[PDB]
Structure formats: structure tokens, C-alpha cells
Design an enzyme around this catalytic site. Structure first.
Site, short mmCIF file in Angstrom:
data_model
loop_
_atom_site.label_atom_id
_atom_site.label_comp_id
_atom_site.label_asym_id
_atom_site.label_seq_id
_atom_site.Cartn_x
_atom_site.Cartn_y
_atom_site.Cartn_z
N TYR A 132 0.87 -1.18 0.00
CA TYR A 132 0.00 0.00 0.00
C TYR A 132 0.91 1.25 0.00
O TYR A 132 0.70 2.16 -0.80
CB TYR A 132 -0.90 -0.03 1.25
CG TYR A 132 -1.92 1.08 1.34
CD1 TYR A 132 -3.15 0.97 0.70
CD2 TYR A 132 -1.74 2.15 2.21
CE1 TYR A 132 -4.14 1.94 0.85
CE2 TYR A 132 -2.73 3.13 2.37
CZ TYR A 132 -3.93 3.02 1.69
OH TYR A 132 -4.92 3.96 1.83
N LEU A 162 23.22 31.63 -3.81
CA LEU A 162 23.77 30.59 -2.94
C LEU A 162 25.16 30.14 -3.42
O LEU A 162 25.97 29.75 -2.58
CB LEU A 162 22.80 29.38 -2.87
CG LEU A 162 21.39 29.69 -2.35
CD1 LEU A 162 20.49 28.49 -2.48
CD2 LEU A 162 21.42 30.19 -0.91
N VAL A 164 28.23 30.46 -7.08
CA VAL A 164 28.64 31.00 -8.39
C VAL A 164 29.89 30.24 -8.89
O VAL A 164 30.75 29.88 -8.09
CB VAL A 164 28.94 32.52 -8.32
CG1 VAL A 164 29.38 33.08 -9.68
CG2 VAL A 164 27.73 33.30 -7.79
N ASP A 280 31.43 11.62 -7.72
CA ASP A 280 31.94 12.98 -7.47
C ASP A 280 32.05 13.37 -5.99
O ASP A 280 31.93 14.55 -5.66
CB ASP A 280 31.07 14.00 -8.24
CG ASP A 280 31.76 15.34 -8.53
OD1 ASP A 280 33.01 15.36 -8.62
OD2 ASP A 280 31.04 16.36 -8.64
N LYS A 282 33.27 14.70 -2.60
CA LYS A 282 34.23 15.65 -2.03
C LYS A 282 33.42 16.61 -1.17
O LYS A 282 32.19 16.62 -1.31
CB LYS A 282 35.04 16.39 -3.11
CG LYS A 282 34.19 17.05 -4.18
CD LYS A 282 35.01 17.43 -5.39
CE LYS A 282 34.12 17.87 -6.54
NZ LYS A 282 34.86 17.94 -7.82
N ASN A 285 30.43 18.58 -2.64
CA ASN A 285 29.21 17.87 -3.02
C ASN A 285 28.22 17.67 -1.87
O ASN A 285 27.16 17.10 -2.10
CB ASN A 285 29.55 16.55 -3.68
CG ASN A 285 30.14 16.80 -5.03
OD1 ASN A 285 31.20 17.39 -5.14
ND2 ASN A 285 29.49 16.39 -6.10
N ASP A 298 25.30 17.42 -6.12
CA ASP A 298 25.62 17.50 -7.56
C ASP A 298 25.77 16.11 -8.24
O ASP A 298 26.65 15.34 -7.86
CB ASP A 298 26.91 18.35 -7.66
CG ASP A 298 27.36 18.82 -9.02
OD1 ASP A 298 26.64 18.57 -10.01
OD2 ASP A 298 28.45 19.44 -9.10
N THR A 317 37.78 15.09 -9.98
CA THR A 317 38.89 15.86 -9.41
C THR A 317 40.01 14.84 -9.06
O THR A 317 39.70 13.83 -8.46
CB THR A 317 38.38 16.71 -8.24
OG1 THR A 317 37.44 17.62 -8.79
CG2 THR A 317 39.51 17.46 -7.51
N1 LIG Z 1 -2.62 10.46 -6.26
C1 LIG Z 1 -2.34 10.38 -4.89
C2 LIG Z 1 -1.91 11.54 -4.27
C3 LIG Z 1 -1.61 11.58 -2.92
C4 LIG Z 1 -1.18 12.84 -2.27
O1 LIG Z 1 -1.55 13.91 -2.85
O2 LIG Z 1 -0.52 12.77 -1.19
C5 LIG Z 1 -1.75 10.42 -2.18
C6 LIG Z 1 -2.18 9.26 -2.78
C7 LIG Z 1 -2.48 9.22 -4.13
C8 LIG Z 1 -2.95 7.89 -4.66
N2 LIG Z 1 -4.40 7.60 -4.45
C9 LIG Z 1 -5.23 8.52 -5.30
C10 LIG Z 1 -6.71 8.21 -5.24
C11 LIG Z 1 -7.02 6.76 -5.52
C12 LIG Z 1 -6.22 5.91 -4.56
O3 LIG Z 1 -6.52 6.23 -3.19
C13 LIG Z 1 -7.83 5.93 -2.68
C14 LIG Z 1 -7.82 6.42 -1.26
O4 LIG Z 1 -7.78 7.84 -1.30
C15 LIG Z 1 -8.16 4.48 -2.75
C16 LIG Z 1 -9.42 4.08 -3.14
C17 LIG Z 1 -9.75 2.75 -3.23
CL1 LIG Z 1 -11.33 2.24 -3.71
C18 LIG Z 1 -8.80 1.79 -2.94
C19 LIG Z 1 -7.55 2.18 -2.54
CL2 LIG Z 1 -6.35 1.00 -2.18
C20 LIG Z 1 -7.21 3.52 -2.44
C21 LIG Z 1 -4.73 6.15 -4.72
C22 LIG Z 1 -4.00 5.10 -3.93
C23 LIG Z 1 -3.50 4.00 -4.60
C24 LIG Z 1 -2.84 3.00 -3.93
C25 LIG Z 1 -2.70 3.07 -2.56
C26 LIG Z 1 -3.21 4.16 -1.87
C27 LIG Z 1 -3.85 5.17 -2.56
#
Ligand SMILES: Nc1cc(C(=O)O)ccc1CN1CCC[C@H](O[C@H](CO)c2cc(Cl)cc(Cl)c2)[C@@H]1c1ccccc1
Length: 467
Positions: A132, A162, A164, A280, A282, A285, A298, A317
Site C-alpha cells: 500500500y 547561494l 557561483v 563525485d 568531495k 558535493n 551535484d 577531481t
Molecule cells: N494520487 C495520490 C496523491 C496523494 C497525495 O496527494 O498525497 C496520495 C495518494 C495518491 C494515490 N491515491 C489517489 C486516489 C485513488 C487511490 O486512493 C484511494 C484512497 O484515497 C483508494 C481508493 C480505493 Cl477504492 C482503494 C484504494 Cl487502495 C485507495 C490512490 C492510492 C493508490 C494505492 C494506494 C493508496 C492510494
């Protein structure tokens, strides 16, 4: 229903985002998703109305429209069809609908209200929350890319400089619409890149830095371009340059050097996990953020290499070049463990171990090796022992490239007592605490004069097409 649950299951496995998810989540979703039906012209969501539901389109198409003000025509945003979805903010809490969703034909949606989604999320397994996070991270970055894709150079203002050089300069910029948001804008002269033959170097820098998500690497949000320059929009790290702090202090204590070396070890553990050589390393960086945590800045010499393959470009370098680079025997990620040993030595003493009056002379003393150096009394035994293991002449025998990879560096006696987990969480107290009063405070950097010189010539050859 058994049939309906399998139809929902087979439908969720066809959606690009949901198909990665485990069977437990997809099955429990299928157990609670319900079907709602609409007809051509019917409003699914109305702008300004309150809502607590997320929709996945299983049949037909919908038109997404919005009005910027009450006395203005609705502007069409997009059209969505089978497999697409909308109304997700209603699950996260916020009820006010910011756009209309109208059916373009006969539509069916699989719906899950806020309370049901919350109840489903509320009681789940420990394995079920791990894939997830991978999908949430993937969609959190695609949403970040889309926020920055909307912006233009005209949306930013310059605050102060920041850094040059011949390359161009690094400016602290502020987003006009959000004054708490400041970024470090690296502005490169395209003419300098062409004169130095770094077209591909800057091209892979953009690819690497944008795709990298590490708290020990400076983020690159997006780039811009015009006829004369390339612009790289980065994370602002207002603690200051490690090279100016090292210059001001002469050398760093053993515990101070250990925290900064540990920051690089984390950045390298991340880059080496993706088959990327940094090349890189050093003090120039490394940049400190407002807390005093160090990050790699960098990615000019960095390169994506295949597992079990080598590269042969002679770069860097001279003081930091590994022996296999000098001898043209090919190199891989193990040249970064050599560099790590050189950095420890320079941070502890103020000077790197190998240095002659020109590149060839510097390469000659490197080929003589780390066992031919008289280590200063300043360097502690455990620090000297780790430097010699990191700077072994044969890259195969080098610490970090042995049995357990980077864990062999993390488990070295010099790091005994070092809280690796506290560093990764950001709760380990850094050795130098910078004083930063606001997002526009540049007092931890040197002062730079404004550039009064003529702009560089236009470069309209399309090597910059992807910027
Ligand atoms: N695009 C984006 C932007 C941000 C942010 O802006 O931080 C955060 C998350 C997302 C991702 N997110 C977007 C919407 C659809 C889906 O999430 C919903 C719960 O909101 C959902 C609906 C069902 Cl039915 C089933 C499940 Cl597993 C999840 C997805 C998601 C996909 C996979 C896992 C979680 C979420």
C-alpha cells in the site's frame, strides 16, 4: 455475490493503479464496493455540493468541468472513462466538491463512501500495509510532478545567490503564490555545457536527481529551459556548504566527521541499491539543511550502470579518483567506497591524502596506495583502520563491496555506538546546529556579487529537448 465479487475482482485487476495491490485488499474492496447507475447528462458530482464518496468508472464516460467564478462560463477540464476514478478527497475528509462530474452517456460507477473506506482501512493486516505504501509513494510523486509541471519560471522570484562558478549560478528562489516555499534554482549556461562536452552528463543528472527519493540526497523537482540556460529547481538546504564550514573550521572532530560520513553512507546505500555510481564525492558535493543534516547535491558525474557491468569514463577531481579509474580497468559502485575513505581523511585533517602539483603527479601518488601514507596523529586508530579498508587498491577487496555490501561499512568498529536508526528517522542530534531564521535566510552562505556580464550565446540545437 460470488459472481459479482469475481467480476469486481477481475475489474479491479484491470485498473493500472489497483492491480499491484494484494488479494486481501482487492477482495475486501470487492466485498464493500456498490454499483450506482447514471444516464447521459446526469450530474454524478456537483461543484459546491458536499460529498463523502470515491467513484471508479466501470462502464461509460464522464465530463469533468469547473467554474472559476459564479459569473463565468464553465471550463472543461477532462473526460474520464472505464478504469478511471474521481472524488478521492471525500475519503480523506474534505467534503466541498471543487468540480462537476457529468455523465457523457449511460454510466456505472463502483462507489465506496468515506465511512466504509475508513472502516476497511481501520482493520487490516501488517503485510497488507507494505505494498500500500509503495503504491501511495508512487502516486504521491506523480502528483508532485503534476504540481510542478503546471508552474513556469515566471511564477518564481530570486531572493539571493547561494553559489557561483563558470557553470553559472545557484539562486535561492521563492514561489510567488506561497512565500513559505523557497527552492535552490541551479541556472546553467548551455554554452559552458557544450564547450565542456557535458550534454549527456547533464542529461543523466536530470534523470538521476528527479527519480531519486532519499533524505540524504537533495531533491530535483523539475527543470526549465530557454535559448541560453537550463534551470534545475531543487530543494533549498539553508544550513550551508560543507566546504565553507570545513574551510572556516580547518578540520572536523572524529564524532563530527562520523555523522557526515554516515549521511553519505545512507545516500550511497540508496544509489547503489539502484545500480547508480555517484563518482563525485568531495566536501563541495555536500550541503547541510536547516537542521544540520548533510545531503549529496551535484549529480554531474553520476551514472546508471547494469548489475555486473563496468564503466570506463575517466572523470573527477584528481585527488578523489580511484586507482581502477586511473589504470582504465573499468569501474563500478566500489569506486564510491574508495571516495568515502578519501572524504573521511580530508574531513579529519583538512587535506585529502594524495596530492601532487598536477593531475598526473596526483595520479602517481594514488597508485602508490593508502598503505604508503603516514597517517597524521590526529586520525584515531578506528578511523585510520576504516580509511585503509575503504581505500584498498583492488576494488574487489574493498570494504562495502564484500559479503554484506554497505552493512560491512555500517558494522565497522568506528561506528560502534552510532545510532543508524536515529539518523534515518532524523532524531540523531547533528554535530553542527545551523541557525536559520526563515526560508529566505541565506546568512550561512558566502556573499556573491550580482552578475553584470553579458548573457551567453543562444543554443537552439535540440540536445536540451527533455529539459
Ligand atoms: N494520487 C495520490 C496523491 C496523494 C497525495 O496527494 O498525497 C496520495 C495518494 C495518491 C494515490 N491515491 C489517489 C486516489 C485513488 C487511490 O486512493 C484511494 C484512497 O484515497 C483508494 C481508493 C480505493 Cl477504492 C482503494 C484504494 Cl487502495 C485507495 C490512490 C492510492 C493508490 C494505492 C494506494 C493508496 C492510494
Amino acid at each position: 455475490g460470488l459472481i459479482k465479487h469475481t467480476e469486481y475482482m477481475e475489474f479491479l485487476k484491470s485498473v493500472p493503479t489497483f492491480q499491484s495491490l494484494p488479494e486481501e485488499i482487492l477482495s475486501k474492496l470487492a466485498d464493500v464496493l456498490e454499483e450506482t447507475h447514471y444516464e447521459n447528462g446526469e450530474y454524478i458530482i456537483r461543484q459546491g455540493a458536499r460529498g463523502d464518496t470515491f467513484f471508479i468508472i466501470s462502464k461509460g464516460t464522464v465530463n469533468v468541468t469547473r467554474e472559476d467564478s459564479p459569473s463565468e462560463d464553465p471550463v472543461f477540464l477532462r473526460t474520464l472513462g472505464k478504469g478511471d476514478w474521481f472524488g478521492e478527497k471525500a475519503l480523506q475528509g474534505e467534503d466541498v466538491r471543487t468540480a462537476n462530474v457529468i455523465a457523457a452517456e449511460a454510466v456505472t460507477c463502483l462507489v465506496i463512501d468515506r465511512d466504509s473506506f475508513k472502516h476497511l482501512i481501520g482493520g487490516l493486516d501488517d503485510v497488507s500495509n507494505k505494498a500500500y505504501e509503495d503504491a501511495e509513494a508512487k502516486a504521491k510523486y506523480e502528483a508532485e510532478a503534476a504540481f510542478f509541471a503546471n508552474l513556469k519560471l515566471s511564477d518564481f522570484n530570486i531572493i539571493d545567490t547561494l553559489g557561483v562558478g563558470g557553470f553559472g549560478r545557484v539562486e535561492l528562489v521563492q514561489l510567488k503564490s506561497e512565500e513559505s516555499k523557497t527552492f535552490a534554482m541551479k541556472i546553467l549556461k548551455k554554452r559552458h555545457i557544450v564547450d565542456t562536452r557535458q550534454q549527456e552528463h547533464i542529461r543523466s543528472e536530470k534523470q538521476i536527481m528527479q527519480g531519486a527519493h532519499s533524505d540524504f540526497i537533495v531533491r530535483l523537482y523539475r527543470t526549465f529551459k530557454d535559448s541560453k540556460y537550463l534551470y534545475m529547481l531543487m530543494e533549498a538546504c539553508l544550513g550551508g556548504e560543507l566546504w565553507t564550514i570545513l574551510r572556516d573550521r580547518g578540520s572536523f572532530e572524529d564524532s563530527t566527521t562520523r555523522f557526515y560520513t554516515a549521511c553519505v553512507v545512507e545516500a550511497f546505500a540508496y544509489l547503489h541499491s539502484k545500480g547508480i555510481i555517484y563518482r563525485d564525492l568531495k566536501p563541495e558535493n555536500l550541503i547541510l539543511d536547516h537542521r544540520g543534516y548533510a545531503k549529496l547535491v551535484d549529480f554531474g558525474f553520476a551514472k546508471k550502470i547494469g548489475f555486473g557491468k563496468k564503466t570506463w569514463t575517466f572523470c573527477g577531481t584528481p585527488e578523489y579518483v580511484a586507482p581502477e579509474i586511473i589504470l582504465n580497468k573499468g569501474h563500478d559502485i566500489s569506486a564510491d567506497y574508495w571516495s568515502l575513505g578519501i572524504l573521511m581523511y580530508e574531513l579529519l585533517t583538512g587535506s585529502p591524502p594524495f596530492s601532487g602539483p598536477d593531475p598526473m603527479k596526483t595520479y602517481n601518488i594514488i597508485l602508490r596506495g593508502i598503505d604508503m601514507i603516514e597517517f597524521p596523529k590526529k586520525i584515531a586508530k578506528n578511523a585510520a583502520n576504516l580509511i585503509k579498508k575503504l581505500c584498498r587498491d583492488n576494488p574487489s577487496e574493498r570494504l562495502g563491496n564484500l559479503k554484506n555490501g554497505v552493512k560491512d561499512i555500517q558494522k565497522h568498529k568506528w561506528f560502534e555506538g552510532f545510532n543508524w536508526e536515529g539518523l534515518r528517522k532524523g532524531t540523531l542530534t547533528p554535530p553542527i546546529i545551523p541557525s536559520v531564521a526563515s526560508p529566505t535566510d541565506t546568512s550561512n552562505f558566502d556573499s556573491f556579487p550580482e552578475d553584470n556580464d553579458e548573457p551567453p550565446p543562444d543554443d537552439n540545437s535540440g540536445w536540451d529537448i527533455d529539459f
